[PDB]
Design an enzyme around this catalytic site. Sequence first.
Site, PDB file in Angstrom:
ATOM      1  N   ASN A  12       0.830  -1.207   0.000  1.00  0.00           N
ATOM      2  CA  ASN A  12       0.000   0.000   0.000  1.00  0.00           C
ATOM      3  C   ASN A  12       0.869   1.265   0.000  1.00  0.00           C
ATOM      4  O   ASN A  12       0.827   2.050  -0.941  1.00  0.00           O
ATOM      5  CB  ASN A  12      -0.962  -0.027   1.198  1.00  0.00           C
ATOM      6  CG  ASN A  12      -2.034   1.062   1.143  1.00  0.00           C
ATOM      7  OD1 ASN A  12      -2.294   1.731   2.146  1.00  0.00           O
ATOM      8  ND2 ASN A  12      -2.668   1.225  -0.012  1.00  0.00           N
ATOM      9  N   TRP A  13       1.682   1.441   1.037  1.00  0.00           N
ATOM     10  CA  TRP A  13       2.609   2.579   1.106  1.00  0.00           C
ATOM     11  C   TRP A  13       3.698   2.464   0.032  1.00  0.00           C
ATOM     12  O   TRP A  13       4.004   3.449  -0.652  1.00  0.00           O
ATOM     13  CB  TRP A  13       3.227   2.660   2.504  1.00  0.00           C
ATOM     14  CG  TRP A  13       4.025   3.897   2.872  1.00  0.00           C
ATOM     15  CD1 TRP A  13       5.069   3.937   3.749  1.00  0.00           C
ATOM     16  CD2 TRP A  13       3.816   5.259   2.445  1.00  0.00           C
ATOM     17  NE1 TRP A  13       5.533   5.221   3.882  1.00  0.00           N
ATOM     18  CE2 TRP A  13       4.788   6.051   3.094  1.00  0.00           C
ATOM     19  CE3 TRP A  13       2.922   5.885   1.569  1.00  0.00           C
ATOM     20  CZ2 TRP A  13       4.884   7.433   2.903  1.00  0.00           C
ATOM     21  CZ3 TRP A  13       3.036   7.258   1.371  1.00  0.00           C
ATOM     22  CH2 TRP A  13       4.004   8.013   2.039  1.00  0.00           C
ATOM     23  N   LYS A 203       3.275   4.662  17.760  1.00  0.00           N
ATOM     24  CA  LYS A 203       1.980   5.310  17.546  1.00  0.00           C
ATOM     25  C   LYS A 203       0.894   4.293  17.201  1.00  0.00           C
ATOM     26  O   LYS A 203      -0.282   4.518  17.503  1.00  0.00           O
ATOM     27  CB  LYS A 203       2.053   6.436  16.499  1.00  0.00           C
ATOM     28  CG  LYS A 203       2.479   6.035  15.074  1.00  0.00           C
ATOM     29  CD  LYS A 203       1.307   5.510  14.215  1.00  0.00           C
ATOM     30  CE  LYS A 203       1.793   5.143  12.807  1.00  0.00           C
ATOM     31  NZ  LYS A 203       0.822   4.371  11.989  1.00  0.00           N
ATOM     32  N   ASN A 269      -4.884   0.009  11.639  1.00  0.00           N
ATOM     33  CA  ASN A 269      -4.894  -0.505  13.000  1.00  0.00           C
ATOM     34  C   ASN A 269      -6.195  -0.108  13.722  1.00  0.00           C
ATOM     35  O   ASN A 269      -6.883  -0.944  14.331  1.00  0.00           O
ATOM     36  CB  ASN A 269      -3.671  -0.015  13.782  1.00  0.00           C
ATOM     37  CG  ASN A 269      -2.412  -0.852  13.504  1.00  0.00           C
ATOM     38  OD1 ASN A 269      -2.304  -2.013  13.925  1.00  0.00           O
ATOM     39  ND2 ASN A 269      -1.446  -0.252  12.812  1.00  0.00           N
TER      40      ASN A 269
HETATM   41  N1  LIG Z   1      -0.216   1.950   4.083  1.00  0.00           N
HETATM   42  C1  LIG Z   1      -0.072   3.010   4.866  1.00  0.00           C
HETATM   43  O1  LIG Z   1      -1.147   3.875   5.062  1.00  0.00           O
HETATM   44  C2  LIG Z   1       1.222   3.311   5.564  1.00  0.00           C
HETATM   45  C3  LIG Z   1       1.575   4.642   5.797  1.00  0.00           C
HETATM   46  C4  LIG Z   1       2.823   4.936   6.349  1.00  0.00           C
HETATM   47  C5  LIG Z   1       3.689   3.904   6.688  1.00  0.00           C
HETATM   48  N2  LIG Z   1       3.330   2.593   6.466  1.00  0.00           N
HETATM   49  C6  LIG Z   1       4.317   1.542   6.815  1.00  0.00           C
HETATM   50  O2  LIG Z   1       5.006   1.149   5.643  1.00  0.00           O
HETATM   51  C7  LIG Z   1       5.484  -0.171   5.763  1.00  0.00           C
HETATM   52  C8  LIG Z   1       5.089  -0.948   4.525  1.00  0.00           C
HETATM   53  O3  LIG Z   1       3.696  -1.176   4.505  1.00  0.00           O
HETATM   54  P1  LIG Z   1       2.861  -1.255   3.124  1.00  0.00           P
HETATM   55  O4  LIG Z   1       1.616  -0.506   3.430  1.00  0.00           O
HETATM   56  O5  LIG Z   1       3.651  -0.825   1.957  1.00  0.00           O
HETATM   57  O6  LIG Z   1       2.651  -2.849   3.039  1.00  0.00           O
HETATM   58  P2  LIG Z   1       1.214  -3.568   3.153  1.00  0.00           P
HETATM   59  O7  LIG Z   1       0.787  -3.878   4.522  1.00  0.00           O
HETATM   60  O8  LIG Z   1       0.257  -2.673   2.468  1.00  0.00           O
HETATM   61  O9  LIG Z   1       1.223  -4.833   2.172  1.00  0.00           O
HETATM   62  C9  LIG Z   1       1.749  -6.107   2.363  1.00  0.00           C
HETATM   63  C10 LIG Z   1       2.929  -6.353   1.416  1.00  0.00           C
HETATM   64  O10 LIG Z   1       3.597  -7.452   1.974  1.00  0.00           O
HETATM   65  C11 LIG Z   1       4.341  -8.102   0.991  1.00  0.00           C
HETATM   66  N3  LIG Z   1       4.504  -9.493   1.402  1.00  0.00           N
HETATM   67  C12 LIG Z   1       3.529 -10.355   1.823  1.00  0.00           C
HETATM   68  N4  LIG Z   1       4.132 -11.524   2.113  1.00  0.00           N
HETATM   69  C13 LIG Z   1       5.469 -11.403   1.905  1.00  0.00           C
HETATM   70  C14 LIG Z   1       6.541 -12.287   2.052  1.00  0.00           C
HETATM   71  N5  LIG Z   1       6.356 -13.460   2.642  1.00  0.00           N
HETATM   72  N6  LIG Z   1       7.817 -11.857   1.766  1.00  0.00           N
HETATM   73  C15 LIG Z   1       8.025 -10.560   1.315  1.00  0.00           C
HETATM   74  N7  LIG Z   1       6.966  -9.683   1.168  1.00  0.00           N
HETATM   75  C16 LIG Z   1       5.714 -10.113   1.464  1.00  0.00           C
HETATM   76  C17 LIG Z   1       3.576  -7.964  -0.298  1.00  0.00           C
HETATM   77  O11 LIG Z   1       4.528  -7.790  -1.329  1.00  0.00           O
HETATM   78  C18 LIG Z   1       2.660  -6.767  -0.028  1.00  0.00           C
HETATM   79  O12 LIG Z   1       2.951  -5.725  -0.927  1.00  0.00           O
HETATM   80  C19 LIG Z   1       4.901  -0.708   7.048  1.00  0.00           C
HETATM   81  O13 LIG Z   1       5.897  -0.657   8.044  1.00  0.00           O
HETATM   82  C20 LIG Z   1       3.773   0.247   7.365  1.00  0.00           C
HETATM   83  O14 LIG Z   1       3.513   0.375   8.734  1.00  0.00           O
HETATM   84  C21 LIG Z   1       2.108   2.284   5.900  1.00  0.00           C
END
Ligand SMILES: NC(=O)c1ccc[n+]([C@@H]2O[C@H](COP(=O)([O-])OP(=O)(O)OC[C@H]3O[C@@H](n4cnc5c(N)ncnc54)[C@H](O)[C@@H]3O)[C@@H](O)[C@H]2O)c1
EC number: 1.1.1.8
Lengths: 343, 343
Positions: A12-13, A203, A269
């Site tokens: 997502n991010w 947070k 969350n």
């Molecule tokens: N989405 C938001 O609103 C947001 C905002 C700011 C920060 N973040 C932080 O950014 C970080 C990344 O989150 P995100 O939102 O990009 O991810 P996510 O939670 O949206 O998505 C899950 C990802 O996990 C990966 N995945 C699943 N199984 C896997 C495996 N076994 N091996 C390797 N990869 C695997 C997939 O490629 C998928 O893209 C997190 O620490 C999150 O807290 C998220």
Amino acid sequence: APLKVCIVGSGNWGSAVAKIIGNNVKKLQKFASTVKMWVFEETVNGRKLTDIINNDHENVKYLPGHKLPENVVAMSNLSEAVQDADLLVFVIPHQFIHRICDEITGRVPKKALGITLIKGIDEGPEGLKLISDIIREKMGIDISVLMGANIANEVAAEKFCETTIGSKVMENGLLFKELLQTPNFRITVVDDADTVELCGALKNIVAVGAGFCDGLRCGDNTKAAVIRLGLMEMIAFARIFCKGQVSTATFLESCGVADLITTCYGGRNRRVAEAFARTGKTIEELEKEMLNGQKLQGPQTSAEVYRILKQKGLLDKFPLFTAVYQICYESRPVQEMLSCLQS
Amino acid sequence: APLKVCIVGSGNWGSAVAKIIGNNVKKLQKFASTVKMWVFEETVNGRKLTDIINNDHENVKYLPGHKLPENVVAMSNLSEAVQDADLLVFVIPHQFIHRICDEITGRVPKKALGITLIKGIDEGPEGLKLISDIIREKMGIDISVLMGANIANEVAAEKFCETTIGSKVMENGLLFKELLQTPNFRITVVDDADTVELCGALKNIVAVGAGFCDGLRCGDNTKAAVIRLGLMEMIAFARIFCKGQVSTATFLESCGVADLITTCYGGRNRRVAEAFARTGKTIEELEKEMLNGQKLQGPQTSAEVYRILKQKGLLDKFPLFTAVYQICYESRPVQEMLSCLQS
Ligand SMILES: NC(=O)c1ccc[n+]([C@@H]2O[C@H](COP(=O)([O-])OP(=O)(O)OC[C@H]3O[C@@H](n4cnc5c(N)ncnc54)[C@H](O)[C@@H]3O)[C@@H](O)[C@H]2O)c1
Ligand SMILES: NC(=O)c1ccc[n+]([C@@H]2O[C@H](COP(=O)([O-])OP(=O)(O)OC[C@H]3O[C@@H](n4cnc5c(N)ncnc54)[C@H](O)[C@@H]3O)[C@@H](O)[C@H]2O)c1
Ligand SMILES: [Cl-]
């Protein structure tokens, strides 16, 4: 020679920042216009996800409906994505950072710089450590940090927000700011990387509590109380866990009070926690049914913080953090979220 | 001799504090059972409000659907309610406070203590003048302060919340704490009354700003930035204009960060600002149309702040406060709220 950027992660991010980086690099000489992105291969709608991204320019699973720039190339082979990269952007759920690091450990150029956007902390045999330290110890490269009030879906919609880059070498922080800043994505660079990173981790604990109170139909006055009490517990935790000084100032950057506010009103969350309070299903079960492969971190973090606070003899001083853990893992009734505010 | 309590004001928040005081008073030997409350007299559904409150025990106009205790007595005569008063709770929209003191200056026992719950500042001759000072100078009694994350409709529903009592004489502050507290209304007493009061006034400027961004459909990330930037401007204003040193910690009390959150998400200033952005009607129009006699403080405070800052050459240091003023009164396009977040 223009600087090759590689994005490790694509969720997502991950996808929203790939959109930001794709458009930014296209308009600066300093950065190579082609941006490599590592995509953990999945088959969606009968097709390889990398093919969907490269042919349709959309991560249909993790950022549906938002078009990615054509100069972002999805890659399933982590090694090929990594070799030759000058800048590494680590944007992947905490629980996969270990397997990814010791796959590319020593297969990345010695001179390269990295930034981590990961919210969480690592619990290992040597104890609780910042994720950034794991990446440092395993990659042997400089690591900066990006944390702020950045709900991915609103960023992808190009709605105005801010963020905080933390970087102990300030020139590296400023380079990443050149890469990432936008008229609608305003960046402040500060040197206290650890406190910035720790804010983004903690947070999510407070967001689970905030979501519980929404489940109890508590309203805005109560949520504000939870946010505020939570912030105080964040500062008090940082004063203990952190090496050397910790300034209140850092908690007033985007990474602190701001990220706490958006997460507790519009984060994932919060939403699952509210569902937990109303349905009586498990977090794990709700995670699977509600988030289509996306990953929570708030509960897991609450468990790690609770353990270290128990080891340190300090649970009684952290009623909010401990309540969130005990409601998540030890069947404490969710009504008692209110109780621990009262005393 | 059980202390006689008296409330000056009876609107949305006043009825709510009068509900609270009525209950706590019956159950405390320190405090006299019967509570005089002054109601500026009006005709609702063909009856005197005072008569409605005393017969039906409900301010049908300003706190509808909540029973006020029988021991709270509505009084049209301001001199009567006030004479013999030990404790005076001031809860009236800011604009009327001069008219009130002019009418009851030197008609209250000299031994009596008072508290101000009014949010706003007053137009003075040498710059910033606090409402509490205008009360001290005209009444000649000790004045405490009460400011916090306290949307009246939620407090009245007995949803959990906090407030901060600001109190130069701590014993005084502690008295009003015993009076006002409940299990769902948690009070902290601090001695920097001026900053506490000043947070109460300034937060309504940020709320108009946040409402405008809601009007433009900006989202939670944007709102978190507004709150955050607003908080920094609030701190920066207090450091310049407060008598004596101003601690960051005060802003982490309920009167600071918490009130800013609850007000920017659930307040009346935010709601009318949103309407201003969407409809293009005037602020005064929308107040009459939307709030059924209830009063805004946000725009007015912003005009007071603008004049101070203009005279002192400080407008550049407070772009958020200035933008709010300019949109409200100088026909600056509302969409420029965003513009000044970017710079
Ligand atoms: N989405 C938001 O609103 C947001 C905002 C700011 C920060 N973040 C932080 O950014 C970080 C990344 O989150 P995100 O939102 O990009 O991810 P996510 O939670 O949206 O998505 C899950 C990802 O996990 C990966 N995945 C699943 N199984 C896997 C495996 N076994 N091996 C390797 N990869 C695997 C997939 O490629 C998928 O893209 C997190 O620490 C999150 O807290 C998220
Ligand atoms: N309502 C809330 O959610 C809330 C919460 C916390 C603090 N506050 C603050 O507390 C203070 C009290 O506000 P409120 O909500 O009780 O008021 P209100 O705006 O809801 O009600 C208007 C009241 O003003 C009085 N009034 C109207 N015209 C008058 C006149 N001509 N002369 C004298 N009185 C007149 C009426 O008695 C009426 O009840 C304000 O400073 C407000 O900003 C409000
Ligand atoms: Cl009631």
